[PDB]
Amino acid sequence: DIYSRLLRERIVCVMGPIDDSVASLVIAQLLFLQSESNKKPIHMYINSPGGVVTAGLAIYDTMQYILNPICTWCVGQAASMGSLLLAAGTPGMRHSLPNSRIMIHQQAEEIMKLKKQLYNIYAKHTKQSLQVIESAMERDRYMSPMEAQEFGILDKVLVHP
Amino acid sequence: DIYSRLLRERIVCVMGPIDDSVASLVIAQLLFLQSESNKKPIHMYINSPGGVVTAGLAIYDTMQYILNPICTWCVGQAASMGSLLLAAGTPGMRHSLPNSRIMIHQPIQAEEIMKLKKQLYNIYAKHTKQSLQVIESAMERDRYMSPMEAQEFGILDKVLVHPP
Amino acid sequence: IYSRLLRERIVCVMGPIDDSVASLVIAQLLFLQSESNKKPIHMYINSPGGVVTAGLAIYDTMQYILNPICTWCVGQAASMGSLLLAAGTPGMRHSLPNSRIMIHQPIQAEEIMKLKKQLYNIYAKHTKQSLQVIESAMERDRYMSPMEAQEFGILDKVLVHPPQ
Amino acid sequence: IYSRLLRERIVCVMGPIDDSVASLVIAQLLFLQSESNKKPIHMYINSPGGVVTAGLAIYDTMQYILNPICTWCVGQAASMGSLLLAAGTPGMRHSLPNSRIMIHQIQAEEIMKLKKQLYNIYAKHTKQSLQVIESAMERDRYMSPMEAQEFGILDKVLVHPP
Amino acid sequence: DIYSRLLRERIVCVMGPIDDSVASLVIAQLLFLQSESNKKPIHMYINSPGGVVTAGLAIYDTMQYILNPICTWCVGQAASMGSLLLAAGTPGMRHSLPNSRIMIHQPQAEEIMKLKKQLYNIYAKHTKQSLQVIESAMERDRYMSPMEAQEFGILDKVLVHP
Amino acid sequence: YSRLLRERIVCVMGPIDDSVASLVIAQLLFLQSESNKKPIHMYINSPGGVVTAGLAIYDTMQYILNPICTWCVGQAASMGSLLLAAGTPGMRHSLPNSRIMIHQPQAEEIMKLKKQLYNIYAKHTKQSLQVIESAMERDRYMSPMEAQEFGILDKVLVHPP
Amino acid sequence: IYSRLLRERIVCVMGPIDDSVASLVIAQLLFLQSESNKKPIHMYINSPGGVVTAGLAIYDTMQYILNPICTWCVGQAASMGSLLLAAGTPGMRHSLPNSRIMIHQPIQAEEIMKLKKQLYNIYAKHTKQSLQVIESAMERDRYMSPMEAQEFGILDKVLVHPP
Amino acid sequence: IYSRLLRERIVCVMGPIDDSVASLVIAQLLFLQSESNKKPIHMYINSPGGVVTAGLAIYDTMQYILNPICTWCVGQAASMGSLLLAAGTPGMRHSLPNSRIMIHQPAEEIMKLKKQLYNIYAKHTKQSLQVIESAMERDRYMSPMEAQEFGILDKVLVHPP
Amino acid sequence: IYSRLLRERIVCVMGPIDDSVASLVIAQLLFLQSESNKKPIHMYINSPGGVVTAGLAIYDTMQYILNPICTWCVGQAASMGSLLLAAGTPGMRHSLPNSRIMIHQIQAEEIMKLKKQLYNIYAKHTKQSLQVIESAMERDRYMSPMEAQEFGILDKVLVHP
Amino acid sequence: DIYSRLLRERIVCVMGPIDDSVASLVIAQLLFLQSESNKKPIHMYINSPGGVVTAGLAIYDTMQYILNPICTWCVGQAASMGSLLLAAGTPGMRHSLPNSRIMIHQQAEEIMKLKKQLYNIYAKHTKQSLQVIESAMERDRYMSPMEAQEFGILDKVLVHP
Ligand SMILES: CC[C@H](C)[C@H]1C(=O)N(Cc2ccc(OC)c3ccccc23)C[C@@H]2N(C(=O)NCc3ccc(Br)cc3)CCC(=O)N12
Ligand SMILES: CC[C@H](C)[C@H]1C(=O)N(Cc2ccc(OC)c3ccccc23)C[C@@H]2N(C(=O)NCc3ccc(Br)cc3)CCC(=O)N12
Ligand SMILES: CC[C@H](C)[C@H]1C(=O)N(Cc2ccc(OC)c3ccccc23)C[C@@H]2N(C(=O)NCc3ccc(Br)cc3)CCC(=O)N12
Numbered sequence A, J: 001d002i003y004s005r006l007l008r009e010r011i012v013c014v015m016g017p018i019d020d021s022v023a024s025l026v027i028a029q030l031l032f033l034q035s036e037s038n039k040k041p042i043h044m045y046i047n048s049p050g051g052v053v054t055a056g057l058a059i060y061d062t063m064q065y066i067l068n069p070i071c072t073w074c075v076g077q078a079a080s081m082g083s084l085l086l087a088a089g090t091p092g093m094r095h096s097l098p099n100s101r102i103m104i105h106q107q108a109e110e111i112m113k114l115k116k117q118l119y120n121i122y123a124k125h126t127k128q129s130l131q132v133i134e135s136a137m138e139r140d141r142y143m144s145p146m147e148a149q150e151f152g153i154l155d156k157v158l159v160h161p
Numbered sequence B: 001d002i003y004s005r006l007l008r009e010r011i012v013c014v015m016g017p018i019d020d021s022v023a024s025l026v027i028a029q030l031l032f033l034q035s036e037s038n039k040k041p042i043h044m045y046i047n048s049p050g051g052v053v054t055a056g057l058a059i060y061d062t063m064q065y066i067l068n069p070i071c072t073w074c075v076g077q078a079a080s081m082g083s084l085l086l087a088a089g090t091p092g093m094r095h096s097l098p099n100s101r102i103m104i105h106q107p108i109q110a111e112e113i114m115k116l117k118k119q120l121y122n123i124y125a126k127h128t129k130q131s132l133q134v135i136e137s138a139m140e141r142d143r144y145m146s147p148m149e150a151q152e153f154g155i156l157d158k159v160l161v162h163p164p
Numbered sequence C: 001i002y003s004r005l006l007r008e009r010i011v012c013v014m015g016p017i018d019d020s021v022a023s024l025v026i027a028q029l030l031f032l033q034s035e036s037n038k039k040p041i042h043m044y045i046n047s048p049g050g051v052v053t054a055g056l057a058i059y060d061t062m063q064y065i066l067n068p069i070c071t072w073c074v075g076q077a078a079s080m081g082s083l084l085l086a087a088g089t090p091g092m093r094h095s096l097p098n099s100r101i102m103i104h105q106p107i108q109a110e111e112i113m114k115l116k117k118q119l120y121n122i123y124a125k126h127t128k129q130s131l132q133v134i135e136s137a138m139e140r141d142r143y144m145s146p147m148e149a150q151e152f153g154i155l156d157k158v159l160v161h162p163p164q
Numbered sequence D: 001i002y003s004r005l006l007r008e009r010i011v012c013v014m015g016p017i018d019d020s021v022a023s024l025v026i027a028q029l030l031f032l033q034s035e036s037n038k039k040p041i042h043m044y045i046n047s048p049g050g051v052v053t054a055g056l057a058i059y060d061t062m063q064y065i066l067n068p069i070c071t072w073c074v075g076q077a078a079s080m081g082s083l084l085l086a087a088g089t090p091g092m093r094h095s096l097p098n099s100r101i102m103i104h105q106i107q108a109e110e111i112m113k114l115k116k117q118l119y120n121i122y123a124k125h126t127k128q129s130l131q132v133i134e135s136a137m138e139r140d141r142y143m144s145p146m147e148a149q150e151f152g153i154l155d156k157v158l159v160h161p162p
Numbered sequence E: 001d002i003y004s005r006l007l008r009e010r011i012v013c014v015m016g017p018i019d020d021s022v023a024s025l026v027i028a029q030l031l032f033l034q035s036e037s038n039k040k041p042i043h044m045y046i047n048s049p050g051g052v053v054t055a056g057l058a059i060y061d062t063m064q065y066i067l068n069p070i071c072t073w074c075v076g077q078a079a080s081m082g083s084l085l086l087a088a089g090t091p092g093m094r095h096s097l098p099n100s101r102i103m104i105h106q107p108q109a110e111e112i113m114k115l116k117k118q119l120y121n122i123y124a125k126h127t128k129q130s131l132q133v134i135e136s137a138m139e140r141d142r143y144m145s146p147m148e149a150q151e152f153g154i155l156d157k158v159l160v161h162p
Numbered sequence F: 001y002s003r004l005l006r007e008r009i010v011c012v013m014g015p016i017d018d019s020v021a022s023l024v025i026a027q028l029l030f031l032q033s034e035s036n037k038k039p040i041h042m043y044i045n046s047p048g049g050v051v052t053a054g055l056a057i058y059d060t061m062q063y064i065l066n067p068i069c070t071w072c073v074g075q076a077a078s079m080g081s082l083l084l085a086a087g088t089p090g091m092r093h094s095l096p097n098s099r100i101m102i103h104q105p106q107a108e109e110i111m112k113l114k115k116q117l118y119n120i121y122a123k124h125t126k127q128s129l130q131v132i133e134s135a136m137e138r139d140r141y142m143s144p145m146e147a148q149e150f151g152i153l154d155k156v157l158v159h160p161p
Numbered sequence G: 001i002y003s004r005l006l007r008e009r010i011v012c013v014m015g016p017i018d019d020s021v022a023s024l025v026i027a028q029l030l031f032l033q034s035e036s037n038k039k040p041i042h043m044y045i046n047s048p049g050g051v052v053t054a055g056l057a058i059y060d061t062m063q064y065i066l067n068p069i070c071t072w073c074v075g076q077a078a079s080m081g082s083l084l085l086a087a088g089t090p091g092m093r094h095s096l097p098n099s100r101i102m103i104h105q106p107i108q109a110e111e112i113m114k115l116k117k118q119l120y121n122i123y124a125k126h127t128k129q130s131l132q133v134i135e136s137a138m139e140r141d142r143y144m145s146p147m148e149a150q151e152f153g154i155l156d157k158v159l160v161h162p163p
Numbered sequence H: 001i002y003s004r005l006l007r008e009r010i011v012c013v014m015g016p017i018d019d020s021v022a023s024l025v026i027a028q029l030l031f032l033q034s035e036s037n038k039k040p041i042h043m044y045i046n047s048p049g050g051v052v053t054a055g056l057a058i059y060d061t062m063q064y065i066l067n068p069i070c071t072w073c074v075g076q077a078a079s080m081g082s083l084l085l086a087a088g089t090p091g092m093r094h095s096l097p098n099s100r101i102m103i104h105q106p107a108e109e110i111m112k113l114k115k116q117l118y119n120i121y122a123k124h125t126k127q128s129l130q131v132i133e134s135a136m137e138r139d140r141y142m143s144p145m146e147a148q149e150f151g152i153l154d155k156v157l158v159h160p161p
Numbered sequence I: 001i002y003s004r005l006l007r008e009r010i011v012c013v014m015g016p017i018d019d020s021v022a023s024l025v026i027a028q029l030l031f032l033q034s035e036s037n038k039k040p041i042h043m044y045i046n047s048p049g050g051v052v053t054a055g056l057a058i059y060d061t062m063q064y065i066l067n068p069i070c071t072w073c074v075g076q077a078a079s080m081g082s083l084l085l086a087a088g089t090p091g092m093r094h095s096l097p098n099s100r101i102m103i104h105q106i107q108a109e110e111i112m113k114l115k116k117q118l119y120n121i122y123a124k125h126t127k128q129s130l131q132v133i134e135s136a137m138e139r140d141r142y143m144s145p146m147e148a149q150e151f152g153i154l155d156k157v158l159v160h161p
């Protein structure tokens, strides 16, 4: 009676390494929250080092599939697939707390196809070029919330509400 | 429990590696939904890298045995035996979300592994509506398909960004 | 879900058979017999086999209870799993289309042979094949299709969809 | 479902016998005695045997309670499992047709002292002499249900209920 | 469930290796049964190979601390600290079933000797044997029958039935 | 075992894998150079093992000129029995209590390899492909005399002649 | 020390018998064959037994070489160990006084029986006991004293010191 | 035994290829070159493949040394094993009759390495980059004669000529 | 250092006695007899005991060889170690001053058959009655060397030669 | 080994935890050095946290058994049984380097009987009373070399020769 209580506030948590199990729980919760209301916003808490790409894409696709506005909230960190989900929140509703850290850095033909899918998703949501996204994803570094805002991963850096 | 709530919505999940325990659980849930209504659609969420062939074939046969229309939904991935289950959804009701990856490549005695493989060729041909010759050739290729490629191939009917 | 299955007179023999699996299956069979000694019990079999005495424990309980027992092979019935499949009530032994059935089998020397002769006598009885044909066939490391298993006498009906 | 089994006066001696299994079975035997000290208790035995003092703990409790105890060998009763099978109330020791029964099985004096307790228990319940028990327990083999019946380990071999 | 059901009948179970968690659980159950009734008997089932000395002494001291009569019952075995607890039951109320095995032998140096002296004094008191007889006996690696334990003063009654 | 190599004795002992095969193969080539006419004695006490490793030894036996006397002691199961049967005609031996098994313990590849085994057994035993295929399905051992009748070996002997 | 033992025509069957132990013993037996056809080989047996086919490999090699083989049971000869003990040349099968000898034996159903019947035939041959006697004796889970093994036909001489 | 084998100008690429196997093979190739830069080197290949950079290390060394290199496929040459087999001096690339050959490999970096493999195979097999690419995607083995027609090897030998 | 000891006719029974320790000790006892069947052998015993049949193997071999055997207890001789200590040639069984000696120690019948063999060996070599041996072996305790001398386990306790 | 070269200079090393195998080697080395010269001093290097009591007593007894002067050298530490061996060197010949640390702190009757043997040995070599040794051995502390000198465990604290 703590995370289910959290679900009653339309809050979904993406915490820790993303794998198929984590993704499937988050996905079910998003569908639950949509049936309760297809209008009311959903808050997505993201504190994650990232994880399995297809599992991250499962969550991403579900976020887009549901009608609801999705507010994303980066707390602690959003690295790799975590930052993709952070960036995939509804335009104007992508948030970070002040000390969060954001990282977009992560057969041979397959991993390249998945990489291009990530480039395309980042391009859609950040408004940066595919050329710049590709370059940025090579760089093993974290961004500050202001840097991430400038890049287009998020809209608001908040100290208080 | 949220997975019990899913079952109340006529949603069944095939997620992670498929083995006998996953199969028997999914099989049990399919019968339950048929008992509640033999007409109402069942939604099958498929996010799986595949698994044990006989366990997947067990789910496959049960899908064909029950009376219900089964809507299959590929999210994340459907690889190997997962893509067979995806392809075995009711005609017109086989779905993928836009960024899913689909693999039909398949990554006991010699005779038996071949007998099973030949069963897979027959099932894929039947459900894709393609010739078995095309299926057998295509299954050698170690690669994934996009949802649009999988639609073209006859593995699925619809690629949906959101509901229509 | 398996408790809810038990309310519908369904018992599941799933995965490797051992003493714990056997005792649960046995307990469930007695439960269903107490609720009604007339009404059929459905035995779901998806098993690679397992411990011989534990399989024989289930076999004896199946024979001991009064009820008709419908056996259903989905996925596979191998080793002791196929014995249980064959031990269903005559006319009520089923397989789904893609199941694999194996009668081949994967303490002192005399004891292993005594157990093997008990298996021969059970297979000979329920399949109607001679002791020599059972003995020769159990030597062959191979699976049978459901139609081959029907022909052999391990089961009665191969069903893609229900009759009614 | 094991709760409901107990409600039907069924106690299970299943798998390797150790102190935890014994003390559970023992607790259950006292439970069924309190509910009714006259109604029969059914003891399901499918065991390869196990720890001798744990098995003797069960045995002593079976004799201690006033209830008639029906023993049922299904699958197998080996070593201490066969002792418990033999310890059922006379006339009420049963096996199903394909079961296998075996009577073959610290300081050296203690193991031998424990072994002599087993000989006396088998001799008592089988009606066999101490020598034929000793000689038979040396033979590494199983008996059929009919052989065990002839030996005095059990009373009835049943294909179906009477 | 079955062990909490046992506790409703004023039965406490000392099962298996005695450690601090087993002792503390047994100790809590003893205090519970005392508050329910400080005059009614508590039954203490003992089937144990022994265990930690301080854990056994924790149980022993609590047995003396509570006002209730404590019936000790040895089933299977009571070895090492388990036989100490068996002997610590109320005079006249220390029991064993017929095939139980009882052992008083124990299987910084000054500290292990100090503990041993405490064990000698406790055994001496409850068995009415001298310290020298207790010392010599505890050196011998052997088990006693229930009748042997009875004549030594470890228990009072060897019961086949109630 | 090094002293055995001085007597033109090679040992196929235990489970056959790539490392076992490579050692046997080098020893076989060594004994060819010392004398490509003198017989080589192959001790076989093996439950079988890796099929390609077994085929590596088989091919090397056929590749070298030398007569190869095969000796089944204890057992020759699976690839071990193939190696036993691949000895020079008239020079394939078993001791009296040995056990011989021809049964074996992508999908297309395992069938391709199995067909290769059928062709080798049929060649060296003079049995048809159907007889080999049926026999390899039976999970049983043959006595040395049965193996002799089948064409796996030539002589079953208690002492040296 | 073990190479020095090999120079004295002494082969050691020690511990659990597996394919590695058998092949070493077999190879050592062939070394001593080449040194002399006539000279006795001494087989030290201190073993709980082991893998049946490995034991039969040793047995067959013992019979195959022409040499007389003196078997010496010290510590124990159990299961396949006792078979090898009994397989020594007639008159030359020895035990020291405190050794224990067990013929009891603590793959498919047909094969285990085929192997067991081979063991019965070997024991019957070397002990001169009937098949029916070997069968019932191998069911009894027990050891024999060196004297009891002597009267059974497993060994010839129980000796405290040399003669 | 392998030390004595080196005296005959034989190097063994056996088991899974890693950095340690590569470094030993590489060191043996340099030794044989200093003993004689004219004399042929025989390369025994019985390998399921392994680490790509380790295989390329061996490959580059084979091209670097002056000597003709006879490659010998016994058992199998899969993945990087088949590349080394194909990299033998033209006319000197051999397989025994029952060997199996596979060029199939079982984010931006792995793509670059994959293209390097395509270029190496194309050079040594005389197949186009598209034929190599399509072939390496297919999970299957070739018989020695199939590998011969593809351009991986020159001679399928039963015995020496 | 260990072969140096063996040239001085010193055999060491160190640590837990198993079949491996016994067979080495037994082999060394034969070696020293062949060198000289009348020259004393020194047996160093520092052992907590071990496998009964392995200890009896050593015991029987000590009785079998012709040589005088000097036993030397240093550190400890417990269980089967003390039997071997007691089994030295009369007059030649030694302990250093601070050693600890313990005589306290398959089917139920067999374990009891083996215990009777131990009782009779101890009875023989200590000259104590069977009552005394059986009662003493029940007691879980150690003897000092003087107690052990008094008991008949050894002859001399010496601080120096 | 360099420890063999040390042995030619009559140096024996008691290093690391003392067990039966460490003790048995030290003991064999002590007998060797005595046979080379029964009058020349032996140097015992002690850098040990202690270990098994009976193994320490085995070394102690052997030190007393041999005729030689034994110089003990504490370097690093001599704790528990190590300090007993240090104290057991020939009077006047027990040494420590300046930064070493020395500690004498460590069935029921049997471990107490062993404890009494230790008290008697420490009393003998330190000249402290039995009650002082008893008391001191309860105290969980290390001594400096000068404190160990005052206690009677060693004679000389040397910075250099
Ligand atoms: C927008 C949802 C759609 C309108 C539609 C649909 O396409 N699905 C398929 C689907 C299933 C499982 C999945 O991951 C677990 C899916 C993930 C992503 C996309 C589709 C997934 C079932 C869903 N249901 C549905 O949403 N109940 C409401 C509900 C769900 C979960 C819980 Br817990 C509680 C209530 C049934 C009726 C219904 O109409 N739908
Ligand atoms: C189309 C189903 C049929 C109408 C029929 C049938 O053939 N079975 C056999 C069967 C058993 C177990 C299996 O996997 C566990 C099976 C899997 C595949 C196919 C058959 C399986 C039992 C089923 N039941 C039935 O439908 N309960 C309703 C129900 C089931 C589960 C749950 Br939870 C709740 C209700 C009893 C009456 C009844 O007639 N049937
Ligand atoms: C056909 C059952 C018989 C009519 C008969 C019987 O011979 N038994 C022995 C028996 C016990 C345990 C076993 O495996 C756990 C047995 C396995 C195989 C064979 C016998 C077994 C007890 C059973 N009971 C009985 O069946 N309750 C009804 C019931 C059982 C289980 C559950 Br859960 C719920 C109700 C009491 C009355 C009663 O008379 N019987």
Ligand SMILES: CC[C@H](C)[C@H]1C(=O)N(Cc2ccc(OC)c3ccccc23)C[C@@H]2N(C(=O)NCc3ccc(Br)cc3)CCC(=O)N12
Residues within 6 Å of the ligand: D023, D026, D027, D028, D030, D031, D033, D034, D061, D064, D065, E002, E003, E005, E006, E009, E011, E013, E043, E044, E045, E073, E075, E162
């Ligand atoms: C014929 C029983 C006797 C009349 C007597 C008795 O001697 N005991 C001691 C005892 C305790 C625990 C044991 O193993 C766990 C024992 C094992 C074997 C023998 C005795 C054991 C407690 C029992 N009680 C008793 O039977 N409760 C009823 C009851 C028991 C268990 C459960 Br769960 C529920 C109710 C209290 C009244 C009562 O007087 N008794």
Ligand SMILES: CC[C@H](C)[C@H]1C(=O)N(Cc2ccc(OC)c3ccccc23)C[C@@H]2N(C(=O)NCc3ccc(Br)cc3)CCC(=O)N12
Residues within 6 Å of the ligand: E024, E027, E028, E029, E031, E032, E034, E035, E062, E065, E066
């Ligand atoms: C004879 C008990 C005394 C009358 C007294 C007492 O000295 N204690 C201390 C004590 C606490 C915990 C211990 O092991 C867990 C103790 C073990 C041994 C000895 C004392 C222990 C608390 C106890 N209480 C008490 O007895 N509750 C009743 C009760 C206890 C447990 C449970 Br569950 C339910 C009820 C409170 C009132 C009360 O006054 N007492």
Ligand SMILES: CC[C@H](C)[C@H]1C(=O)N(Cc2ccc(OC)c3ccccc23)C[C@@H]2N(C(=O)NCc3ccc(Br)cc3)CCC(=O)N12
Residues within 6 Å of the ligand: F025, F026, F027, F029, F030, F032, F033, F060, F063, F064, H001, H002, H004, H005, H008, H010, H012, H042, H043, H044, H072, H074, H160
């Ligand atoms: C009939 C042998 C041929 C005449 C020829 C040959 O085809 N090879 C290739 C080859 C190498 C390695 C292999 O597995 C390790 C091979 C396995 C199977 C087949 C070929 C193998 C090397 C051999 N050599 C050769 O045999 N030395 C003699 C020799 C070998 C080993 C040792 Br150690 C000592 C001497 C060099 C001269 C020479 O020309 N050859």
Ligand SMILES: CC[C@H](C)[C@H]1C(=O)N(Cc2ccc(OC)c3ccccc23)C[C@@H]2N(C(=O)NCc3ccc(Br)cc3)CCC(=O)N12
Residues within 6 Å of the ligand: F001, F003, F004, F007, F009, F041, F042, F043, F071, F073, F160, G026, G027, G028, G030, G031, G033, G034, G061, G064, G065
């Ligand atoms: C009585 C031996 C025979 C006369 C004959 C023979 O049949 N073999 C086959 C054979 C090989 C390996 C085996 O287990 C490793 C065998 C085991 C059992 C039976 C045969 C075995 C080789 C042996 N050789 C032979 O004995 N070298 C002498 C020798 C052996 C080992 C060592 Br080390 C040193 C010299 C070479 C030529 C020679 O004449 N023989």
Ligand SMILES: CC[C@H](C)[C@H]1C(=O)N(Cc2ccc(OC)c3ccccc23)C[C@@H]2N(C(=O)NCc3ccc(Br)cc3)CCC(=O)N12
Residues within 6 Å of the ligand: H026, H027, H028, H030, H031, H032, H033, H034, H061, H064, H065
């Ligand atoms: C064709 C070799 C060249 C002539 C040249 C050379 O470029 N190297 C660099 C080099 C080092 C290590 C490597 O893998 C371990 C290399 C691998 C690939 C390429 C270069 C490697 C050292 C070599 N040496 C040389 O080859 N001795 C002969 C030799 C080497 C090894 C052994 Br073992 C025995 C003799 C010193 C003299 C000498 O001039 N060279």
Ligand SMILES: CC[C@H](C)[C@H]1C(=O)N(Cc2ccc(OC)c3ccccc23)C[C@@H]2N(C(=O)NCc3ccc(Br)cc3)CCC(=O)N12
Residues within 6 Å of the ligand: G001, G002, G004, G005, G008, G010, G042, G043, G044, G072, G074, G162, I026, I027, I028, I030, I031, I033, I034, I061, I064, I065
């Ligand atoms: C008193 C010894 C006897 C005179 C006689 C004998 O009965 N044996 C059998 C035997 C073998 C192995 C055993 O444990 C390894 C035995 C253990 C206990 C008893 C017998 C054992 C071989 C021994 N040998 C012999 O004396 N070598 C001398 C020797 C032994 C080892 C080493 Br290393 C070096 C030389 C050969 C000739 C010879 O005549 N004998």
Ligand SMILES: CC[C@H](C)[C@H]1C(=O)N(Cc2ccc(OC)c3ccccc23)C[C@@H]2N(C(=O)NCc3ccc(Br)cc3)CCC(=O)N12
Residues within 6 Å of the ligand: I001, I002, I004, I005, I008, I010, I012, I042, I043, I044, I072, I074, I161, J027, J028, J029, J031, J032, J034, J035, J062, J065, J066
């Ligand atoms: C002072 C030694 C004595 C003079 C005497 C003796 O009592 N022993 C028994 C003994 C053996 C083994 C032991 O731990 C391994 C012992 C440990 C402690 C005490 C005795 C031990 C054998 C020794 N030897 C002897 O010392 N060789 C010289 C030597 C020893 C070892 C090496 Br390496 C090289 C030479 C034979 C002649 C000889 O007479 N002695």
